[PDB]
Amino acid sequence: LVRVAPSLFLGSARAAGAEEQLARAGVTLCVNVSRQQPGPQAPGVAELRVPVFDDPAEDLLAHLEPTCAAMEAAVRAGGACLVYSKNGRSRSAAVCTAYLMRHRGLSLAKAFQMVKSARPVAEPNPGFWSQLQKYEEALQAQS
Amino acid sequence: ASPVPPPLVRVAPSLFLGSARAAGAEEQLARAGVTLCVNVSRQQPGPQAPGVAELRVPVFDDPAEDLLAHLEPTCAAMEAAVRAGGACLVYSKNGRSRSAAVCTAYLMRHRGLSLAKAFQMVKSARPVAEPNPGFWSQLQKYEEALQA
Numbered sequence: 001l002v003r004v005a006p007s008l009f010l011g012s013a014r015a016a017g018a019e020e021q022l023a024r025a026g027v028t029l030c031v032n033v034s035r036q037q038p039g040p041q042a043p044g045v046a047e048l049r050v051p052v053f054d055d056p057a058e059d060l061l062a063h064l065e066p067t068c069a070a071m072e073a074a075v076r077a078g079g080a081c082l083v084y085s086k087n088g089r090s091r092s093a094a095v096c097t098a099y100l101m102r103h104r105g106l107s108l109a110k111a112f113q114m115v116k117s118a119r120p121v122a123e124p125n126p127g128f129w130s131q132l133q134k135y136e137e138a139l140q141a142q143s
Numbered sequence: 144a145s146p147v148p149p150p151l152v153r154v155a156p157s158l159f160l161g162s163a164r165a166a167g168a169e170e171q172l173a174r175a176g177v178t179l180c181v182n183v184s185r186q187q188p189g190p191q192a193p194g195v196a197e198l199r200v201p202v203f204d205d206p207a208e209d210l211l212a213h214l215e216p217t218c219a220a221m222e223a224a225v226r227a228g229g230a231c232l233v234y235s236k237n238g239r240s241r242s243a244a245v246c247t248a249y250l251m252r253h254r255g256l257s258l259a260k261a262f263q264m265v266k267s268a269r270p271v272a273e274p275n276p277g278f279w280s281q282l283q284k285y286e287e288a289l290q291a
Contacts, residue, residue: 029216039199046213048198048220049189063196066179066223070198073219077212 001025002088004118005104007080008071010096012088016040016047028079031067033060033091046074054090056127064135067095068102075103093122098135108136146237147271151175154268155254157230158221160246162238166190178229181217183210183241190232196224204240206277214285217245218252225253237271244274248285258286 001011001021009015009025016022016030019042030040035051048070052058071081083099085091093115100111112132116122124132146162151171154160159175161168166180169192180190182199189197198220202208221231233249235241243265250261262282266272274282 028212035193043185044201044209044212046198046200046216048196050196051194066196066220066227069223070216070220074216077215079216 001082002118004096004115005100007075008096008099009080009082010088010092010115010119010122011082011084012092013037013084013086015082015084015088016042019043022082025082026080027082028077029071029074029081031071031081031083031092031095033083033085033095037086050091050095052091054085054087054125056125056130058127059131060091060094060128061131061135064095064098064131065102068099071099072103087121088119089121090124090128093119094124094128094132097124097132101132101136101139108132144237147239151232151234152238152268154246154265155250157225158246158249159230159232160238160242160265160269160272161232161234162242163187163234163236165232165234165238166192169193172232175232176228176230177232178227179221179224179231181221181231181233181242181245183233183235183245187234187236200241200245202241204235204237204275206275206280208277209281210241210244210278211281211285214245214248214281215252218249221249222253238269239271239273240275240278243269243272244278244282247274247282251282251286251289258282 030047150164151161
């Protein structure tokens, strides 16, 4: 695991099965960005599955707002979120960036470089990156 | 033990409660525009419905389980799905305790109902509805927290 920001962690496939660190990190919600992959054995840890493959043609944007709202509520309740995908490089990086934009008032550049600074391999696929820019322009418009 | 029918029930707008059979009624879920399944259990299988986000709230139907700790974060995910124009399915094995408690808390937290009327809506939609005594205690505490 990697702490991206206060109360926000990013991880790869095995992260949800590291039950003892999840309790150490105070993780209370795992966001599992996949269609086929196992939930955390972690007891007492809620898990939200966002069902998309790591492929540019899948619609992640449609899930961003309700997933970020779940994450923020978990943080505001005094817990922390772990966002993870198979590689810990695209899907989970995309959701982490979207979260930082929606609830920590960052731009894509500064949000993604927060993510990249915690997880160097971070690299949302180009379709997700386009959807992240569209997500930002939606956040601009509502302002 | 086969769960009490029907598979799923409308409790209130954009909000359905269900038993084990609910997650296995994929076409009713798509017809109702359910965009979020709330699986209130440790061991029940998620909605075999594809592309629908699923939130597991890991508790047994046991009075010593802390459901209260999950309420605020579960209710906010449900509200976000409702606001985006979809619907939520809250389900537990029997469709009587865990899922009824979460539906009740959701009505209190985001539709401004008291515990009395939130549960009255749940029980009217699902007559067997009965949060176990520990869950009821946690609902009473959640209500007094919401007042303050």
